[PDB]
Design a binder for this molecule. Structure first.
Ligand SMILES: [Rb+]
Ligand SMILES: [Rb+]
Ligand SMILES: [Rb+]
Ligand SMILES: [Rb+]
Ligand SMILES: [Rb+]
Ligand SMILES: [Rb+]
Ligand SMILES: [Zn+2]
Lengths: 67, 476, 469, 470
């Protein structure tokens, strides 16, 4: 069950439905995309990510050096 | 009247006919967001929408709380049909009231301290979380009031700050946040992440509508955050209570949910995309995450969340008059002829100023002043100036003034290479503006008038007949 | 839902809370005009105001009958909270319906023929006349449907009617166009010119009388088109066999233009919001009054816009412009030409190719009405409701690069009623392209708009039904 | 009113009216035939057709510049050769909507184009004296053919044809918008798409093929309308029952677009005056050639305007624009949209009220063609002949105050074939109001024009008759 945004298999279940067995929420460990088992999300090509886009993503704000 | 929390405001809304109860159970997506969009689409008298049952969840959701001028009027304790101009004058009258220091309340007497979660923190067992827009990166908390301060100096709330920032749920006990968008936390965060220390914040959900109002206000007021809320309550202090884990952080006593946590140092993860007030999606960026160390909430809390999309939605009402009142005060300091400023359109990119024209051409001078204020300089792209008797919030009145007092050959000025804002997607070059000034005012000497007309001044007794017809209208 | 007369519309207005009854005796001035202005100043959901008692008068007055989008919606038989855009689509849908010939009813079947005043004619014993604006030259009948005329030559328009005497009124004869040749011949031969002045009407009759151009049907046939195929009842005038009036009009004034008489008429307010001048205008003698029992003087207040008169000129200006543009540009979605008889126009359209938004504006600026009238033309995208000015202002602030999206064209046709024109009667047009660029126009930064969530349309109906209960 | 049944009857009239030159001595294919076409166009006025009796290494003859003057254009319409361009415009507008004039289908035996048939060893060079039109052309080109493709859905247009083999040619498939629907299905099924390429035609046939929009009739009916009610003769093609060709065509090449075949075609000149780019385009296999005895290759030179191609696009672009303007604007007198497929337009109109001329230009700039094509729009008064560029210059120099009569509107639709567009494909429109002010526009100094002396029209007729008798 791949992540709809970046296509990674590195997906884990975030939570179960607090009431009943209605749904679950999954989350991608690579790009942090999350979705419920209810919805069938189609991610627009403009909003899809690959390792290239993630590695070249803008880091806001820059992490200062230690010490 | 004054509201101690959101529930008091919600019942006032329902009593005035500004709240709908969706009795049946709904799905998280796309029901709640589509209802928020639907309520926004009603145009006028748009109510808040209250969901009692959401599938898989145990608690409630309310949306479009601020999403109409009726709800906005009731927020300030006014009659719900109060015109936007009159709401603007009431906000301007209350803006500078001081002092009204907040009332600090014992921990037990604070309703936000009723239930405590300190282990196995799961936001989903508290908040019915859902996807606001189709292409959002995750489920978002979109109407939180986020509290920061300085640890060493409590500053007696001189350094404590409250603003609204979008909160992306990353896990059961983790959320994303836009750290650079949190001014007053920049150097506090650089120091924290340089020596690898957490930075504590408090995230309050479900508040007194004036608290969300001040939180949606970033500049323009000189009082302390909670003191400004008191100033907007016509001089009635609000109740605050110390956070459980952090001494320097104070939350409102009546919040439905309080999320106490800290920014995790040296951590950047993909946040977004999410909607922004220009009606489009932000980009996905590597932003900061917050660990949630404790949750304190009222019994059966209500997830007060906001839908935003193509304007107008609720977000526009959170930025309408709190943008316009500061600009009006800056213009008025040097131009007492200014009657009102309507800067409600895309965070003041569109501005309509009503003014008395001192002498010929004075209306463009008023625009020059706006285009030289801290906010109007880079933001304000389209500036319309109308006469003193024209309500600049009545766009039908502004249209009339445009069609009868604007000679586009001379009343319209196009000025290139001025400061701009990148969030205006039509800027070319990006971040630069070509300004447009429109002088929809009647010529006064020494400007020649091509055809002087006598306007149809309202008949005597008009104001009294307004109050008369109004009292007859509520008695139907 | 259709209405036989004004009374059927008024009772529907009261059912929807869109009518206020003033049960107490008021003074003719300034009370009635101030209530018309106050009703307009309520901004939204503005009601009609009905005065049961006016000092010195026998009968009643109603004002602001058309003075809100709620009232406009009920006039079309729609739910009162129907948006303006949907009212525009409803009007456009009915506009061309043909044939709906009117029903000529016998005289004793027409309620307007209930009472007859053939001698000692006194307008004041029928209409509670008053001064509308303080600088008016006299008391005015401001919402009358005036009939002139075979049936193809019959015309109905609304014209201001200044009361000059108990049986004499002023009229702007040149403002009536189908009478110019007939009037020159009548005054050259020193003959009267018969006209019929109707007061208190089916709201769609007044709407058609407020429409001077844009329809191909006959006057009363067009009313049948506005009623979604329901014919309206008409009846022959008492004195003039070629003049037909609505059967259920509250008051019918049968008279004639007095030949070769010019007297001081005005001043009086006009829709741009200012006083017109006093001119030597034609007078009309009233030869017969024909009225229902307990007649209702339906009159209009006008002043600084918006007032009721803006509603009588809003969508009936916009629909013909939309049809003219739609014939060659099917991408056009809606035309909002409601501002000062269409001097300000907002067009929503799909953009076929780069720059197409200005081509749409060029089309409007070359229509018979848009060419001299339309000075400010804003073009917005297909998803923007051009009747929602908040949405239009959003489009302005995010889709207008004033360095290229704003075009200023000098020495174009204008209208003298625009007081800012210099030279008078000439326009400098302003086109504003508040649309999103499409190829091959380069985009400085293309964004993805927050498309509304699935199920939004169904949730609008559900929320409305929930507010009903 | 002369109606022509083929190219020969028209070439005869041209020669009789002094509008055709015979080159009796042998010429080289290049650069003689092209240079002669360019030289004929360069003559400026009364430019004639040029007929080459002998070309080196070829058996048959070539004619060029057939449509290349207003005299030749007038004789095409059956009018006296010195009929003014304005009057030729008014005649086309009169005949444009004539309906119905259904074509007359003749039997194969009676169609001169069926005189000789070649089905095996097809060699285009044994029929057409093929030559290079311009120095950088990709090869030798058929530049004036009428291509028939398919009765209401039969279409005739002109498309450039690059000769690739003795029996193979290249064609601009996407330029034939009407074949795309069947073309995609054909290529996906590997199916030939039959076409017919006719060369050397009655001049009104080529005019209709050079007209891609603006008439409601079907192709051959429209020719009949342009012939004032005389039907034109057509004949069924030899191999394809649904394709009909003119009965009098000099040569008919029946064949098919080859599916799934894309080869480099071009460069070739285009009417803006420059070479096109060399693209991979569709190829056509010629399956049968039917031609008259002693066929005459009617080809066309194109270069820096004006050349013959400008006359094939001049008045058939103007007439539809005139009709669209006239519907709502009866004051419009004539539309001259002859310059670079209507990128430059001159309109003469009566000015109904102050500023009306700019409204007329707005209407043109919102027509389906004028909106993306027309960049420079000049409006003149009703008494100014918009086709007489001297009179237009007079209106410009005496009625244009550039501070107010000249409007420049950015970010409007444009066409990429205008190379000066920046951004490419977008236009900055220019409206020039060369009309006299009428109220309520103020006139800085009103003048009394020198209206023509009474009898001028009668004296025009008298002087022309007097000249002929000399
Ligand atoms: Rb704040
Ligand atoms: Rb002005
Ligand atoms: Rb009418
Ligand atoms: Rb634009
Ligand atoms: Rb054609
Ligand atoms: Rb001019
Ligand atoms: Zn992912």
């Amino acid at each position: 069950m791949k992540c709809h945004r970046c296509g990674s298999d590195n997906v884990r279940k975030m939570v179960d439905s607090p009431v009943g067995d209605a749904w679950e929420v999954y989350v991608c460990e690579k790009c942090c995309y999350s979705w419920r088992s209810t919805e069938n999300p189609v991610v627009m090509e403009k909003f899809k990510l690959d390792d290239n886009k993630i590695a070249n993503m803008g880091v806001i704000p820059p992490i200062p050096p230690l010490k | 009247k004054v509201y101690k929390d959101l529930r008091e405001f919600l019942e006032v809304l329902e009593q005035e006919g500004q709240l709908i109860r969706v009795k049946e159970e709904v799905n998280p997506e796309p029901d709640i967001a589509a209802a928020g969009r639907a309520a926004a689409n009603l145009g006028k008298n748009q109510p808040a929408v209250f969901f009692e049952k959401i599938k898989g969840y145990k608690y409630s959701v309310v949306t479009n709380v601020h999403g109409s001028w009726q709800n906005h009027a009731l927020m300030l304790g006014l009659d719900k049909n109060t015109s936007t101009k009159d709401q603007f004058y009431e906000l301007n009258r209350r803006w500078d009231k001081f002092p009204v220091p907040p009332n600090v309340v014992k921990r037990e007497a604070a309703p936000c301290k009723e239930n405590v979660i300190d282990k196995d923190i799961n936001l989903f067992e508290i908040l019915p979380l859902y996807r606001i827009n189709e292409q959002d990166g995750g489920f978002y908390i979109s109407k939180a009031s986020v509290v920061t301060a300085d640890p060493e100096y409590p500053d007696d709330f001189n350094k404590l700050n409250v603003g609204t920032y979008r909160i992306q749920v990353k896990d059961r006990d983790r959320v994303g946040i836009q750290a650079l968008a949190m001014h007053d936390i920049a150097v506090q965060l650089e120091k924290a992440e340089a020596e690898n220390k957490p930075l504590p914040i408090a995230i309050t959900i479900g508040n007194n509508p004036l608290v969300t109002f001040m939180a949606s206000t970033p500049v323009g007021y000189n009082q302390n955050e909670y003191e400004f809320v008191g100033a907007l309550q016509d001089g009635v202090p609000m109740d605050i209570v110390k956070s459980d884990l952090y001494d320097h952080l104070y939350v409102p006593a009546g919040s439905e949910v309080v999320l106490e946590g800290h920014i995790i140092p040296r951590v950047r993860t993909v946040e977004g995309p999410f909607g922004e007030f220009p009606g489009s999606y932000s980009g996905a960026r590597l932003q900061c995450e917050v660990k949630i160390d404790r949750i304190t909430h009222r019994t059966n809390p209500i997830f007060e969340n906001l839908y935003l999309g193509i304007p107008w939605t609720e977000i526009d009402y959170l930025m309408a008059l709190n943008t316009s009142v500061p600009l009006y005060k800056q213009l008025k300091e040097t131009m007492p002829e200014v009657v009102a400023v309507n800067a409600m359109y895309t965070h003041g990119i569109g501005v309509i100023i009503s003014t008395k024209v001192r002498y010929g051409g004075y209306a463009k001078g008023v625009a020059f002043r706006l285009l030289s204020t801290p906010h109007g300089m880079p933001y304000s792209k389209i500036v319309i100036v109308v006469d003193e008797f024209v309500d600049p919030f009545n766009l039908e009145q502004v249209m009339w003034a445009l069609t009868t007092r604007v000679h586009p050959g001379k009343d319209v000025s196009i000025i290139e290479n001025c400061p701009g804002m990148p969030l205006d997607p039509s800027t070319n070059p990006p971040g630069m503006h070509t300004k447009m000034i429109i002088d929809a005012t009647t010529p006064v000497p020494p400007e020649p008038n091509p055809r002087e007309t006598q306007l149809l001044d309202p008949p005597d007794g008009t104001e009294e007949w307004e109050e008369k017809l109004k009292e007859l209208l509520k008695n139907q």
